[PDB]
Every structure is written in structure tokens, then in C-alpha cells.
Amino acid sequence: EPAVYFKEQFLDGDGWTSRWIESKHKSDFGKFVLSSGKFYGDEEKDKGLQTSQKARFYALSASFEPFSNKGQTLVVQFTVKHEQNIDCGGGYVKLFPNSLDQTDMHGDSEYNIMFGPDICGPGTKKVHVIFNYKGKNVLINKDIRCKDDEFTHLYTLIVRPDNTYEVKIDNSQVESGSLEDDWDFLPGSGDPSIYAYDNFGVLGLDLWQVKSGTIFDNFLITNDEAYAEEFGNETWGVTKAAEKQMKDKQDEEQRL
Amino acid sequence: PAVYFKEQFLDGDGWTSRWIESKHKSDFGKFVLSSGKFYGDEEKDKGLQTSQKARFYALSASFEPFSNKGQTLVVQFTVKHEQNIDCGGGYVKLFPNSLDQTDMHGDSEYNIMFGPDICGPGTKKVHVIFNYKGKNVLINKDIRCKDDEFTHLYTLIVRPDNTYEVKIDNSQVESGSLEDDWDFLPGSGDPSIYAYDNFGVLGLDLWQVKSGTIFDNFLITNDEAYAEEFGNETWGVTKAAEKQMKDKQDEEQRL
Amino acid sequence: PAVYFKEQFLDGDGWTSRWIESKHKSDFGKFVLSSGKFYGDEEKDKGLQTSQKARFYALSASFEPFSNKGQTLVVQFTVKHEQNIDCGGGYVKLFPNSLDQTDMHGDSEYNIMFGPDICGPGTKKVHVIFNYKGKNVLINKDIRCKDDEFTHLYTLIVRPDNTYEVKIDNSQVESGSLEDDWDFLPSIYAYDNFGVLGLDLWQVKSGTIFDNFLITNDEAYAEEFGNETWGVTKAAEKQMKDKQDEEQR
Amino acid sequence: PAVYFKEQFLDGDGWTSRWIESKHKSDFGKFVLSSGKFYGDEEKDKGLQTSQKARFYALSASFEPFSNKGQTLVVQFTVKHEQNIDCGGGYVKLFPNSLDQTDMHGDSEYNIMFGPDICGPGTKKVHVIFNYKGKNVLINKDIRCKDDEFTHLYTLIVRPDNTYEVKIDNSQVESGSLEDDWDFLPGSGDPSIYAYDNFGVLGLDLWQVKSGTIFDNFLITNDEAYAEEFGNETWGVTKAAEKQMKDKQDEEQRL
Amino acid sequence: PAVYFKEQFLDGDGWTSRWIESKHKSDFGKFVLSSGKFYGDEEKDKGLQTSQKARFYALSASFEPFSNKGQTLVVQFTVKHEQNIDCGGGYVKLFPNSLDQTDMHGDSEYNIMFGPDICGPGTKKVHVIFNYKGKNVLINKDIRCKDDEFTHLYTLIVRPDNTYEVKIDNSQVESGSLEDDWDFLPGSGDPSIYAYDNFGVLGLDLWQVKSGTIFDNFLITNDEAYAEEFGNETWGVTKAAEKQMKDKQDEEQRL
Ligand SMILES: [Ca+2]
Ligand SMILES: [Ca+2]
Ligand SMILES: [Ca+2]
Ligand SMILES: [Ca+2]
Ligand SMILES: [Ca+2]
Ligand SMILES: [Cl-]
């Protein structure tokens, strides 16, 4: 059976406030609030963490029973909804070693992997895939376009023990290849262990936003690609059509 | 001193032309060349590493066939369970030259199987298995294997008087006679039990939950003294620097 | 040789008048007198056995108080993880006589802690902890403990020149000086008062048996007693267990 | 790892340009290059052999001077009393560079003396002597040396926290602190006792009744792990084959 | 005259309760109390000596916090590179009281760094570094440090008009204004550059190849004249006798 290292849907009211921790590294971090926003597919299911303040840094994280991806597939997946029509701001997650002090998390804390959408003005609509290796944060050399509309989108990163990876948006492949080719880690054949991290213990939302209102939901860390795809269809795939219908209706009333 | 087989994986990707993957199944785990996260020497300590969790493995190497009839047979290699293994094999198999390497699997007919096997706190055992009269006969003595994360040397010595010796880290841990330490027959005796007409392949054919085991410094020879020399030139050269590098990493982890 | 404490549990249920259960908590696991499923001698090898899974334990024995000032201190006992332990302690603690035995727990102030600690394939360690200036200072050397199912002898030697030695199965495995092998803030080694030995620890899989406790000031006597206890258990224990393993298969 | 001195006598008669005979006396015994009557390898196991009975010996080798201040000092070499010695030294001395090699003798001022000493039934001892405040201070622990006919590895480790270790055949036999294991001073302590400004010469300066002792594989380094490695590449490679050749000769002698 | 910090190590081992070892790393070198092989006065000239080769060091002393705002700041101490240093620092750092002394290291944020730095033939320099706007700004003037084996006095004077002076052996070697002698800003204008809200710790945080450097007679004060007095009562009292003892030892060495 598939291993589920982390799952968060924010289905149990305020239960999440005991699973996530705010960094105190700075005194003026923005606050996340629980919200399904102005339109949604289901008012309760579509609750997630929403950035609530403009022009702020954010730093909130959740711990889980530590694990290693050594010898295994790693899948990192979540939904992102820039309801506010974002101008400039991140929508990405970071996976940290368990040695991270959650109350001191910030932009320069050492993570293992960073993944997800980053928007800044007309020029930047990009999906980051960053691997930490030999004390450097190495950025993917392929150009992956992210979504930028107001609707909920599913982001999936797959990393395999043969050093292959795949990136999906809305459960459909948008990029793939090998770590040795698509990042500048090192000369020659490569190092067959690049993909692997001794320890994963925390998932962080650690990012900057000008216009706020982004909602993060349906986080999943697993070792099974098929399961990730299922869960994507049970979450994003259930949100999608009703969300779009409610928003069309509101747009019409606005016009009128 | 006859050297029937030697593998140290010193010549880059050269090993990929000396070893053959079985296609008996479609979902065998893959070996990769690696010295892992700590080592005595980054290059010397490269070996074959299991790269996937909860898998069967099946990779082999041929050599000029030989018979141990009338002679001493020595089988030796290093094993390193870097990953702190929960359950998995670390043993080799010696096969007749009639083995189809591309069809090797758990039920292929081997001559001898030798080496460490771990499964939970309860099983930490060295297997010594002889194939005789279509049965795979298991040693009756209980030999404890090593279980830590470091590189260990495993040596099997089989002699034409049907005596055998097992060594770990170049030091004897078990010895006796085939007739006493296995149930081949109800009483004495068949003085030829030790002997095989043909050896042609060495296989790594095994199961692993947590992966990351590294195999290096394989030797098949007819000379005990040479085996001991080679063991000191390989394992014996790895040992102290490996332990020093790992202590350092453990300390940095603690801070 | 001074014998400050000896316990071999040889006199039936006599031990129940020498040891005291902490009531600090209501759900501590219970020790039971047992030689387990295999042994060298069904009677001699009786000792205190942890009887419940996933529990804290807290049982202690008092003795006529003493100080090690100007003397060698030797702490010795046998540990047998019969159950093939996954995670759990096998160490003792030596406490000042000011300890309330009926309130002993994990945070009670001890002088010295010593012995095997196992938690998963990754940790198989011998603790040597000294209490100094209100800190519990952990040895900086890495000492591997035993992890099989058989009875093993653990011995800590502390000398008035601030040297120490650790033995397993009556054979040295570690040695040095207190000043080098711990980060202490000349008599670091010395305590005004020892009055209680406690088994205060955690266990997932239970079944560990503790026997043959000795606190003495004589290294040679400790070694003798080790050979008269562990050394007499060893071979017959292993033989009975090999036999049971064969029948099992 | 710093290698201050290495000598294996592998380059024929090359050694004769690296070692100097004292002329302090006219009747010193002579060293000769030899692997003796039995060996693991006739060439590799060549070393300096005492060639005359009831004699003083005095031969030395210079190296680029160094200080062990702030660092680990490791002194290591092999000794083989092939002749079954009755009485004689097998130890080395490390000297300051101010030593006149041509005048070396029993009373020359050394920094450290280390190694086996045998004299009759009573004495089989490893010396560890430190020169301090114009006295030669003898270790207070009793360390047994080897006395059979085979090659043994002797290793002294001295560390800048004033700890030391002694190994025989790459395995610890003694350890502790300088302040405790020698009478330098009435109490602690002078943390610099371990340290010498200058090492420039290694000497074999000693007495022998029955001659035939072979010295090989000298190493002075600052790295314990490297010393252990080199030990396993030298002693560890001689060991088994040496023993096998000698057993064979013992058997033939008996018949 | 305010004395914010004074250390002469005159009260035996008393210093061990005034200074704290960083535990940021496990392998920092250790300071030991020592007057070395030569000295003016065996007791007075005790100071902190680096005891291990090729190591980072990290030891610090706290004092009642203060600010130099509106006042003169004088930082003074003696340095003796007894070992004839090849490469290594001899400088101090003044830290804010917010520093965790048990975590001090090379990247901890200091206010001011001052003192000699030697690295090979090319570098014999006195550092004067001011932390400003999250940068560590290095003086633009080239100040030669001393490099012989003897004890030298180093003095930094910083004044509330943003002037500074550097002295060696109680005699001026450099002077000027902060705005001219560092690149804080493209042009003149921040008169408070000299000033720090708080000083709470003095650290020895540095690297050394060849070890043996002795630090003594630390003084932090607000009075230039008092610094000069103390310098003459410390360095000035060490100087002549130290030189005389060392000449005597050099002469004995030459014979
Ligand atoms: Ca939700
Ligand atoms: Ca190799
Ligand atoms: Ca008992
Ligand atoms: Ca040689
Ligand atoms: Ca002083
Ligand atoms: Cl009971």
C-alpha cells in the first residue's frame, strides 16, 4: 500500500491550528487565515490557508513523522488558488529536514526541496523546482510556465530513485527529465544519489506576497504516483467545475 | 595461487560490461555504482549498491569456469549496510556455467550460497548453503553476522577434506566438517560433498526492504593466505578512515 | 573489598522487601521475578523482568549510604534483552540518599547513570552520565552496546584520579579520563552520598531481565563476581537457546 | 596526512644512502639487508637484520625535521625476532636534529624511545620512554611484548591532549594519559610534556645476544588512520604467508 | 577612568570561570594557560596560549555591557607569537551583549575586530574592522604588524569625533578619520559611525596553522592615558627580561 507521509485538507474546523506553527524569526510576518474565499466548489471542502495581508513575508510550517525518500519515489502535491489575481508573489512549498526549528523558519533556512508557482509581473510565471545539493540551492534549468488565473490549480512534483522527475499541473504532465541533465549539479555522469535526502520532517510555506488572498489546500506527500493522481482527482478534480460555475455566475451579476 | 574472479569496480563504468541483469522478471531492483555517504576512499570504496526499496535483485558476473575438486575453494567479498538495514540479504551465490544469466532468479539452481542475512532483531545470520542431491542444505550452526553501518569482510573457505571455515573481518568465527554441520546424509559419509564440477557465475540474487547495501571487493581463489592478504589490502585499508569520516558526520548531525 | 550493594534475587520473594515501586505515576509498568524462557539455571538466573509493553518503569533499592571520595567506585549488573528489543533502556541510576523512592521518576536528580540504551537499528549505545553543577553530562565517546537476546555483563569503573573504564562481558571496551571524555563546566568523579540504585526507564517491547547487581570499591572483586555470575550463566544459556531455536525451525 | 618518515627497503641497496652507521665505537655489530629464512614475500619482507651475536648496534636515518607540538605523533615499525631471541632490544629512538649520527650511542640524548625489549624469562616488555627535564622517564604500566619468531607491528600514538595509545599488530594493548602513567611531576600538571621542538633522526641503538632480528616498514606520521592503513598494507600482507612458509619448514625439520 | 574589562590571568586557574568555550563546533582548538618557554616573569607572563595546530579557536569573556557613544574607546592587549608563526590570527573581537558565547564562531556578528594577522611572506597586517550597515568594513591603510617571537602591545583608540589611532608597543603607527580610512559611504557625512549601542563580550575567534601564540594583559577602557600606563606596567615590564632570557637560550642552542 502507498505511504502517506503528510496529508492536509483543513476539513476539521480549527484543528489545523494545532498542526501548523508560525515562525517568530521576524515580528512582522503576514498571517494565514482559514478560508474558502468568495467563490468555491464547496464552501467547506475548499477551505485552505489564505494569505491575509498585503506586501508581507509569510512563514508557517507543519511537521510530520520524518522519512527518507532513499530507494523510493517521492511525490509532493498541493492546490494553489490565486483568487485575488496576483501581481507578484510566491505559491510554492518547501520540504525541510527535521532539524529545522519551525519557530525560526525564514527565507534563508536550509531546505531540501522547493517546489511550485512563482509570479512576478508580466514577465514571470514560472514553476520552481529547486534541489539543495552540496550546500547550494540549485534551480531547474527548464522553463515551466505556471497558471495565473483566479481558479484552483493542482501542482505535482514526482522524484524517482533513478534520478528522473516529472512536473504536473492539473494532473497532466508539463515537464520531465533527469536531474543530471535539467540542473547543474556537477561534471560528468552525475552521482546517482542526488535525488535522495536522509530526512524530511517539515513542510513550509515560506514566501513573499504583494497582493494577498492566495489559498493553499489539499497538501499530499506520498511515495505513490498513482495515489497522488487519485487524490488529485478527488480534490482538485472535485473542486474544478463547480468553482468555475459559481465564478461565472458572479462575473455575470457583476457586469449587470 | 589461482584467481578465478576478482571485482573491485575500480575502472569507472567498466563493470557494466562484466555483469548481466536477469530479465526473469520486469520489476527487479537496480544496482548502481556508489561509495555512499561515507567511505574510507571515495573511489576505492565504490561498489554495487541496491537502489530501490522492497525489491528483488538479480545481477551476475561470469568467469572462466573451474572446479574445486581436489582443491581449496575460497569465496570472499565486502558488504556494507549503510542504510541500517531492517530486512534484506547480503549473500552471494556461486552457479554452474549452465546458468542462463538473463533468467537468473530465486529458484535458479546454484552450487553454493554464502553470506549475511538480516530480518528484524531476530535474524542476524550467516548463510552457508550447499546444493546436494537436488536439495539446498542449510548449515546447522548459528553464525551471527554483522549488523552495523560499516564495511565488513565475509570469507568462506572450503577444503578437499570436507572441512570448512567462515571468517568475518579476517578472523575465524566458525569451523568444522561438512558431514557434521549439515544434514546431507543419515551417517558418514560421501567424501566428495564439498566438490562441484563447474563454477561459472557469481550472482547477487536477493531481497531487500530498506535499500542502500554496497557490495565490493569480490574474490574467488584457491589460496587462503592470498584471500587474507587481499582482505587486508581492501577491507583493511577501508576500515579506519571509513569509521573516522562517519564519526565526524555523526557529530555534525548532533549540532 | 567493600560491598555496598549486592542483589542476585536468590531467596525467593525476599526481594520484595528490598525494592520499592515509585508512585509518581499510576501507570508504571510492573517488574516481575523471572528467569524467562531460556536460561543457564532456572533458579540462579531469576531477575527483575519488565512485564508490560510501552511503559515507563521505576523501581529502586536502598542501601547503607556511602561516598566514593578517595576511592574506586564499581557499578556492575547483567542485562538480558530476551525479547529481541526494538526500543528500550537497560541502564541503572545511582542516586543520593535524599531521593524519595516512592516519587522516583525520569527527572529525579541522580549522581550517575550507566548502561545500554537501544532504539531502532540506529542506536545501540552505552550511556555513561555524570551529574555535575546541575547538569547531566553525557559521555562524548561512542560505546556500542550488545543487542542480541543473551545475558550481558555491564561494568563501570570510576577511579579517584578521574580515570574511568567501561567493560562489557568482563572485557574492556572503553577507557580514559573524565576531563577529556566529557565536557564538564579536581574531584569531578566524587559524590558525597550514594543511597539508592534505581531502574528508571522506558521500554516498547518488554521482557528485559536484570540480575546480579553489584556496587563495590574493588575492580578485581567485581571481575570475580562477574565470572561467578554472568560467567556461569553464559554457556548453558546459549546451549538451551540453540536447542529451542532448532525445535522452532 | 603528513608522512615525516617511511622506510620499507624496497629499492635494492638504496637504503645504504639513507642510513648512517655510528663510528662512536669500532666494534658495533653490522646490519644487513635480509628477508631471513622464512617470509611472506622474499622481496617485500626485506629489512635491516642484526648480523652478529653479543653486540651493540647503532644505525640511524635522518628526515626533514618536524615538531609534534599541537599535533598527533605516530611512530610505527615491524619487528621479527626470527632467531627466537634470548636477550636483546627491538626498539627505536627518536632524536632531535642536533644528534651527530656518526657519534650515536647508548648515552646519546633522545626525545622518545619505543618498542619491545626481551631479556630472559622475566622480561618481555614494551618500553615507552619520554625524555623530560633531563631525565628518561619510563612508563609505569606493564606492557607485554611479543616473543615468538614472527613479524609483529608496533605502534605508538601520542596526542596533544597528553593522551597516548600503544598498539601491537594494529590492536590496542595500552592507553592513558602521560600525567598518570609516568612520574614526570608530583601532581598534574604541564600540559606540554608530550611535545618536542624537533625530531630529525630515527635510530636503532641497542644491544643483542642472539642476533637475527629484522626491522622493516618504519613509519612516522601525524595520522592514526593512515598508520593503521599502512600497517594492514605491510604487516597485514606479510602475516599469513609468513606463517604458512614457517609451518612447512617446521614440518620438514621434524622429519 | 572607566575600566570595562581587564584580564591578566594572575590568579591561578581563576580565568576558567571568566571565559567560555564556544560549542558551535566539536573540534575547536583549546587555549591553555602558559608563559611558554621564555618570558620576563614566569608567573606574570602567563596568558592564553593556542595549544593545537591547524585549528579554529573560539573563547570569550563577558563583562558589564557599555556603549562608547559620546566617549573614547580603547582596546588593548599583548600578543606573543613564540612559535614563529607561519599563518594565523592574533586579533580580538568586540561583540554586542546579544552574542551567545556558547555558539560564537567566525560568522557571529561583531561590532569591531582588531589586531595582527599573519599569513605567509605577503601578509603581516593589523586589522581594524568596523561593522556598519551589516557589512564588515576593512581599514584601507596598510599597517604592518610585528612578526618576531617576542611580546607586543596592540592598542586601538576610537574617539567620538570619528578619529582613531593605532599603536604598537605604546607608540603610534597609524591615525586618521573613519570617514577617510574606510569606505563606509561614497562621501562624507555620518558622524556616528564610531559608535555602538553595546559591547558585552570580547572574543578570541580565529584560525591558526602553527600554534603557540600567547595572549595576555587585555584592557578595555575609555582613557588613552590609562591605557598607556597599563601598557608600560605590563608589556613594558615584560620586554627586557623576556629578550634577555631568549638571547641566553639562543646562545645555548648555538653551542
Ligand atoms: Ca480544504
Ligand atoms: Ca571498490
Ligand atoms: Ca539471579
Ligand atoms: Ca621491507
Ligand atoms: Ca599574565
Ligand atoms: Cl514476582
PDB file of C-alpha atoms and ligand atoms in Angstrom, chain C residues 7-10 33-34 43-48 78 209-212, ligand 3:
ATOM      1  CA  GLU C   7      21.349  -8.326  44.558  1.00  0.00           C
ATOM      2  CA  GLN C   8      21.022 -11.758  42.934  1.00  0.00           C
ATOM      3  CA  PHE C   9      17.385 -12.485  43.804  1.00  0.00           C
ATOM      4  CA  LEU C  10      18.299 -15.929  45.178  1.00  0.00           C
ATOM      5  CA  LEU C  33      10.659 -12.088  39.172  1.00  0.00           C
ATOM      6  CA  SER C  34      11.567 -14.429  36.308  1.00  0.00           C
ATOM      7  CA  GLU C  43      16.822 -20.522  39.776  1.00  0.00           C
ATOM      8  CA  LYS C  44      20.111 -18.649  39.622  1.00  0.00           C
ATOM      9  CA  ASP C  45      19.070 -16.657  36.552  1.00  0.00           C
ATOM     10  CA  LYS C  46      15.980 -15.200  38.118  1.00  0.00           C
ATOM     11  CA  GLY C  47      15.991 -11.432  37.985  1.00  0.00           C
ATOM     12  CA  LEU C  48      13.704  -8.481  37.527  1.00  0.00           C
ATOM     13  CA  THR C  78      23.671  -8.190  33.996  1.00  0.00           C
ATOM     14  CA  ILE C 209      15.787  -9.266  32.723  1.00  0.00           C
ATOM     15  CA  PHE C 210      18.170  -7.523  35.175  1.00  0.00           C
ATOM     16  CA  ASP C 211      20.206  -9.647  37.601  1.00  0.00           C
ATOM     17  CA  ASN C 212      23.420  -9.763  39.621  1.00  0.00           C
TER      18      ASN C 212
HETATM   19 CA    CA F   3      19.556 -14.159  39.832  1.00  0.00          CA
END
